[PDB]
Design a binder for these strands. Structure first.
Lengths: 242, 49, 785, 36
RNA sequence: GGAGUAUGGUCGCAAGGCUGAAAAAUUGACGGAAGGGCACCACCAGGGGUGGAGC
RNA sequence: CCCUAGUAAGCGCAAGUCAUCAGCUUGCGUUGAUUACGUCCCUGCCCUUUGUACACACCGCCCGUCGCUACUACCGAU
């Protein structure tokens, strides 16, 4: 796997430098490469090691000496506690779904970033069968969280709203929560919306263009439906004549 | 080709994530994709004992 | 054409499967039968054995508030309920897919929770005999169950799941081990705490208390660690005192006491046992001041230890009715009354008629045993190279001879006259012992795996490691012929009573039949799924069947063959491990078969569809409006009592039901079905369209079938009278729904125009220079002609 | 004849004329006439 | 004499038996339910044979 | 068992074409209807649930029993 001479092999607590300026670590019983390291200039000559912990000191024909420390235990602890927090909050999401607390369910679904349950929560909250009359989406608490959404959550919600707006079956629930989003936030915020994940097809111009053109199609459909729906007034006028 | 990393898109055009998808729906989606793909000298002791 | 049947089975106390129960009886699991011993006297009380089942039993549970009923969980996924009064199975439960592994009972004993290796836990009613429901969590197998109602379980994905039972979904989960597996569960009897034993030897400790808000029931109060770092098999709590026992599959059982969590729990004692313990269990005897810890080992034994609460003594043990490791050879008497079984570590000889052991010797390893005629003395060739000689009637060791140096005696055959024995070893030689004095040796090319004589003592046959057989003459050892054609080395052989046939069992999964004049293979017959260990002829042709032979293989099967017509006449199942040895009687009426099981055995319309759904919804609407009037009169108990189809579909509204039955049909079939619908069915459809437009859902579908209804019946509507009322209702509701949806989408498109213009104004340009050439989607659109 | 049929079916070689594309001359790659 | 094409001989290899007749697969094996299309080997409406005697 | 328009059915006249056919074959004219010409309900057969084109417009993750592969830990002999 090397590209030049190796010139130094050091035991851990293995590592090998190269003359191809890369120093790579792996393990013996497995026998395949674990990691590679690319700090230096032209060459690399020698490796020292801390004798207590695992700290590598690499130096070469270049004058810089680089000191590396192991972080595998720390990132394993971080991944462990991340999976702990993930299973805990996924279960509290399932709990809120089962209890019917649509508000904290929607907050936790926007936090957990997976939307197949978020769409079901939105269809439920726009069809609750007992809506508050002043509320935008039926629930004042869901109105409150859609008013108090942050910029990254607004942009991620818009990036899900174009996908829900594609489907003509979820088009009413996407249009209603988009109506709540526009009535909650002013135009200057949604125009100056700056989120680090805006590159290529998911930037703000193309997202708002997709949402706009699919909403144009849905609006044309509902306008044809209203114009055809005056037939019921015609039939009631005929029965009033008789 | 234009979906997210964790999520899949269905035939309906709706993003559903692999994490929130259950085991039964994972098995059924694997079966539907597979349906579309189908449409297209040792020792004496070691011997005896 | 007489077949064979299982008649006897013995040589076994507790198997390596789990879950010992105490009742002063010990109830343990042999392979397919659950058998109950006295610990005081070694005679077993009873065996529970079912003729319909063959699969092995691997979970036992005692019902609380009623002993003499027990729940056993087998390997195929079935559960049986036995009685200790009468040894029958009252009820059987076939619910799971594979391998019941953990049982649990309710406090009242009316409800039974069984968790499998196919990861389903199913709870069972015991007065209606119906599978109640099926709780579904758990990435992989459930290793702990308990009834707290509430259920508390833990699985091999290192998750504790706290389930509800009134609403059959999980209330809590927690993850016990971060990167390992939670392996055992132990609950305090007062439900104050639960300790879960994980893969590293770490014992996590949890406290229990006794939906829209943050529910918190299980709390990780701390971690403990034991002494041995093995996968911990069980954690068992004392039902009365303040102790528990933690054990993995090893030779130590660690009893800790209940007084940081390290201050709360201290190791009381560590008990060493002679063998690897599979399942510990608790026992409290009436009238003693002690702790009767009943361990049941993998090495085929029960031990009752006394632990003094505020050291261990090997108080009681059951080892006489079973070999302790693994039977490698059997050899049954010339009078066929008793047999000898030779195992690693031991010799135990048994009576057939009583199936109870009579004599016991200790040897190092026991490859091959055979007694000498008169059945006074027995011969054992061992792994270390030697040949030991014992005797039955005085039960002693006579002689020992270093036959080969350190090379295992793989074959021992007594002469049919009875004056000599031959030992073929893992060295190249094979030696002859006349009685014992060495008479003649035979040096040959490779290691001799198996040799046998002829029933008329005329020719000998060795079977090498070179995948070949050498048949020699008995008087002078000249090569009569050699048999070839085996891909893998020959494990065994048996030749016929008149020496006109040889069967030769190899490791290439077949047996060969040779004719022994010219040594032509009669027919190579591939008959087993694994490497066939041993073969044996029945010696007497007094019954007219002397050319039949048995063959036992690593795929847990014996097969009864006929060499004259070259046909398998029977397949003998019933062994749950790789069957190492077998022998037939000299009369040939029964045979013994000794396995890896450690159990030696003895064998003797679309429109009509939417119309009927409309009528169902109409009756539901009438019942709901009557129930509204009743609950408006008084808040008394009034049940709506709707249809079982609705309470089975899950108490959905009639609107949702009729919407789904309108949604299911494809649009052309929807056109035809609404055309076929009659005018008696039209007004119910019009009320449900009013209901859809009121509680707005599928407004395009609602308007589509509404305008189809009006256009295909326009004259009849303007001639009828009640359509005026319901059509006025549907007009108001549909116009409100359409205006609401249209105004929302108009606000959306206007806002998108505004924010798009503002974003263009943000995007336009910063610099100004001479080149405004810096200031569009494009699609490809191929077309063939 | 029956064994000949079984051999052809198993090591399947059939002498049926196969459906060729009508525009193999002008469109030899067989591109699809939609979004590209 | 060169280049081809044939025809029949001659020679060499092929032409030495651990032997004794009756797999592939991330692409595979089998189904079910729903919805279509077609059929005088289907329904529907009729017609006509054969089948009874003799050759 | 067969049959839906110059079809069923009647009638004669002629030929005898390297295979078949005189115990018949194949042509050729003449007279010429009834009843279906719908539906997949029965019996079946084929096919969709992947592809093969883009606008309108419509639909909206079909279902089961196993295999194979990768990883994870388990069981027990050598």
């Amino acid at each position: 796997g090397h590209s030049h001479n190796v010139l130094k092999v050091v035991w851990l607590h293995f590592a090998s430098a190269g003359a191809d300026t890369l120093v790579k670590v792996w393990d013996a019983n497995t026998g395949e490469t674990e990691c590679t390291l690319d700090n230096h200039e032209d060459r690399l000559w020698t490796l020292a090691v801390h004798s207590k912990t695992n700290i590598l000191a690499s130096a070469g024909s270049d004058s810089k000496v680089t000191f590396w420390r192991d972080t595998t235990a720390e990132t394993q602890a971080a991944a462990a506690q991340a999976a702990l927090k993930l299973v805990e909050q996924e279960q509290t999401l399932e709990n809120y779904i089962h209890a019917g607390a649509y508000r904290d369910a929607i907050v936790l679904a926007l936090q957990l970033n997976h939307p197949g349950r978020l769409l079901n929560l939105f269809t439920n909250v726009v069809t609750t069968r007992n809506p508050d009359p002043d509320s935008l989406t039926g629930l004042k608490a869901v109105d409150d969280v859609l008013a108090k959404l942050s910029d990254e959550q607004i942009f991620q919600l818009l990036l899900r709203l174009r996908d829900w707006n594609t489907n003509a079956r979820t088009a009413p629930v996407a249009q209603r929560v988009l109506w709540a989003l526009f009535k909650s936030h002013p135009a200057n915020k949604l125009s100056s919306l700056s989120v680090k994940g805006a590159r290529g097809h998911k930037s703000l111009n193309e997202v708002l263009d997709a949402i706009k053109v699919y909403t144009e199609r849905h609006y044309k459909r509902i306008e044809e439906l209203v114009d055809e729906s005056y037939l019921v007034e015609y039939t009631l006028r005929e029965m009033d004549a008789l | 080709d234009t979906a997210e990393k964790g999520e899949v898109v269905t035939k309906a055009g709706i993003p559903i994530a692999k994490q929130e998808m259950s085991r039964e729906e994972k098995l059924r989606r694997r079966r539907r994709e597979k349906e579309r793909i189908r449409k297209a000298v040792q020792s004496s002791g070691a011997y005896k004992l | 054409y007489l077949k064979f049947e299982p008649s006897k089975s013995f040589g076994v106390v507790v198997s390596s499967n789990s879950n010992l129960v105490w009742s002063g009886q010990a109830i343990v699991a042999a392979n397919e039968e659950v058998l109950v011993w006295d610990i005081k006297k070694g005679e077993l009380l009873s065996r529970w054995r079912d003729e319909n089942c063959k699969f092995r039993v691997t979970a036992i549970a005692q019902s609380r508030t009623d002993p003499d009923v027990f729940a056993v969980g087998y390997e195929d996924g079935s559960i049986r309920l036995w009685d200790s009064k009468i040894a029958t199975s009252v009820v059987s439960f076939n619910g799971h897919k594979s391998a019941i592994t953990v049982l649990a009972f309710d406090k009242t004993g009316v409800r039974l929770a069984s968790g499998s290796k196919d990861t389903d836990i199913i709870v069972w009613d015991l007065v209606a005999e119906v599978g109640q429901y099926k709780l579904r969590g758990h990435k992989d197998q459930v290793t702990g169950l308990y009834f707290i109602g509430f259920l508390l379980t833990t699985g091999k994905d290192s998750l504790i799941k706290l389930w509800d039972l009134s609403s059959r979904h999980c209330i809590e989960t927690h993850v016990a081990q971060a990167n390992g597996e939670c392996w055992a569960l132990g609950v305090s009897p007062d439900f104050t705490g639960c300790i879960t034993a994980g893969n590293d030897g770490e014992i996590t400790v949890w406290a229990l208390d006794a939906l829209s808000q943050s529910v918190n029931f299980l709390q990780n109060r701390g971690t403990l660690h034991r002494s041995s770092k093995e996968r911990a098999a069980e954690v068992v709590f004392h039902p009365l005192r303040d102790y528990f026992a933690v054990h993995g599959v090893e030779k130590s059982v660690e009893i800790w006491r209940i007084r940081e969590v390290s201050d709360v729990f201290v190791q009381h004692v560590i008990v060493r046992t002679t063998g690897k313990v599979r399942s510990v269990d608790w026992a409290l005897n009436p009238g003693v001041k002690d702790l009767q810890l009943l361990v049941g080992g993998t090495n085929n034994l029960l031990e009752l230890y006394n632990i003094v609460g505020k050291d261990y003594n090997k108080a009681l043990a059951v080892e006489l009715p079973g070999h302790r490791t693994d039977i490698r050879s059997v050899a049954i008497s010339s009078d066929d009354k008793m047999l000898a079984s030779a195992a690693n570590g031991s010799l135990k000889i048994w009576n057939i008629k009583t199936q109870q052991c009579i004599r016991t010797f200790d040897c190092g390893y026991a490859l091959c045993c055979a007694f000498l005629p008169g059945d006074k003395v027995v011969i054992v060739g061992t792994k270390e190279g030697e040949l030991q000689l014992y005797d039955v009637a005085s039960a002693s060791l006579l002689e020992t001879v270093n036959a080969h140096d350190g090379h295992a005696v793989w074959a021992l055959q007594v002469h049919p006259d009875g004056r000599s024995v031959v030992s073929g070893g893992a060295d190249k030689t094979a030696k002859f012992w006349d009685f014992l004095v060495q008479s003649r040796i035979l040096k040959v090319s490779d290691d001799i795996l198996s040799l046998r004589f002829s029933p008329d003592a005329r020719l000998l046959a060795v079977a090498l490691l070179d995948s070949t057989v050498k048949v020699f003459f008995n008087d002078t050892l000249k090569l009569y012929l050699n048999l070839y054609g085996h891909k893998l080395p020959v494990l065994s052989m048996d030749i016929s009573y008149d020496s006109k046939l040889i069967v030769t069992s190899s490791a290439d999964k077949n047996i060969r039949i040779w004719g022994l004049d010219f040594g032509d293979c009669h027919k190579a017959l591939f008959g087993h799924q694994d490497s066939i260990l041993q073969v044996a002829f029945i010696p007497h042709n007094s019954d007219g069947n002397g050319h039949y032979f048995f063959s036992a293989s690593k795929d847990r099967t014996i097969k009864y063959w006929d060499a004259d017509k070259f046909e398998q006449i029977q397949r003998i199942d019933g062994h749950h491990g790789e069957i190492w040895a077998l022998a037939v009687s000299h009369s040939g009426r029964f045979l013994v078969s000794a396995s890896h099981d450690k159990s030696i055995r003895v064998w003797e319309m679309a429109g009509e569809r939417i119309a009927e759904a409309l009528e169902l919804g109409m009756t539901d609407l009438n019942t709901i409006r009557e129930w509204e009037e009743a609950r408006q009169i008084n808040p008394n108990i009034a049940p709506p009592q709707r249809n079982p189809i609705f309470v089975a579909l899950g108490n959905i509204p009639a609107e949702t039901y009729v919407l789904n039955t309108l949604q299911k049909i494809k649009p052309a079939s929807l056109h035809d079905a609404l055309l076929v619908l009659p005018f008696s069915t039209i007004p119910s459809l019009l009320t449900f369209l009013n209901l859809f437009a009121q509680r707005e859902l599928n407004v395009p579908l609602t308007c589509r079938i509404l305008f189809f209804v009006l256009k295909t019946h326009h004259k009849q509507i303007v001639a009828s009278r009640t359509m005026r009322a319901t059509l006025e209702k549907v007009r108001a509701n549909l116009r409100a729904a359409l205006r609401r949806q249209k105004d929302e989408m108009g606000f959306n498109i206007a806002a998108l125009k505004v924010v798009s213009m503002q974003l263009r104004d943000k995007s336009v340009r910063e610099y100004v220079d001479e080149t405004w050439e810096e200031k569009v989607r494009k699609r490809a659109f191929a077309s063939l002609s | 004849i029956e064994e000949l049929i079984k051999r052809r079916i198993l090591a399947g070689e059939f002498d049926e004329v196969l459906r060729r594309r009508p525009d193999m001359f002008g469109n030899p790659h067989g591109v699809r006439r939609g979004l590209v």
